[PDB]
Amino acid sequence: GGLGGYMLGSAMSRPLIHFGNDYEDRYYRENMYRYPNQVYYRPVDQYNNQNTFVHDCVNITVKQHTVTTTTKGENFTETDIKMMERVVEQMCITQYQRESE
């Protein structure tokens, strides 16, 4: 709530994601522009476990995304939240890779 400590990663291509049924697939296709194409995060330094960092990226990215979202006067269903979490998770992982050297 005090902000700070976050860095912003480069923009990423939205992957085609399949959700296992016809409705979520169509729903996803239609609604995905409303979900993030970037992630918020704290450096690597602060995490010795990629499995964590990813958690600290999905929830953070989504709250911050909703506050900026509440401003435009629109609302998220429960499905949006599920779909948004899943794709940002994919994104955080790619983001995690960023350092290999």
Side-chain angles (χ1 to χ4, degrees):
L3 173 132
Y6 289 73
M7 228 150 65
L8 190 57
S10 151
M12 296 175 141
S13 296
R14 306 192 183 218
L16 163 48
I17 297 180
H18 292 278
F19 278 90
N21 67 54
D22 303 309
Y23 185 89
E24 293 190 37
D25 273 19
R26 182 172 164 172
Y27 184 91
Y28 185 66
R29 273 187 325 75
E30 299 179 349
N31 288 270
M32 53 187 296
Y33 71 92
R34 300 173 57 208
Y35 313 149
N37 70 344
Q38 217 85 210
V39 298
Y40 285 124
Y41 68 113
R42 276 200 110 131
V44 41
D45 167 322
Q46 336 231 341
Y47 311 103
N48 216 319
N49 172 293
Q50 154 179 1
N51 280 87
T52 65
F53 166 24
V54 186
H55 197 55
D56 184 288
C57 153
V58 174
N59 45 213
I60 303 85
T61 298
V62 183
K63 326 201 70 58
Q64 188 59 270
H65 195 59
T66 74
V67 57
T68 189
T69 292
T70 193
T71 74
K72 288 84 183 178
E74 191 40 20
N75 304 30
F76 291 168
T77 302
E78 314 172 2
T79 306
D80 288 322
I81 303 297
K82 177 176 86 176
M83 294 178 164
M84 180 153 51
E85 285 174 1
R86 183 187 180 185
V87 338
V88 311
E89 182 173 324
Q90 292 188 5
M91 285 184 232
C92 291
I93 297 187
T94 37
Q95 195 68 258
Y96 173 91
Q97 284 172 299
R98 308 269 214 212
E99 340 82 49
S100 318
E101 319 137 338

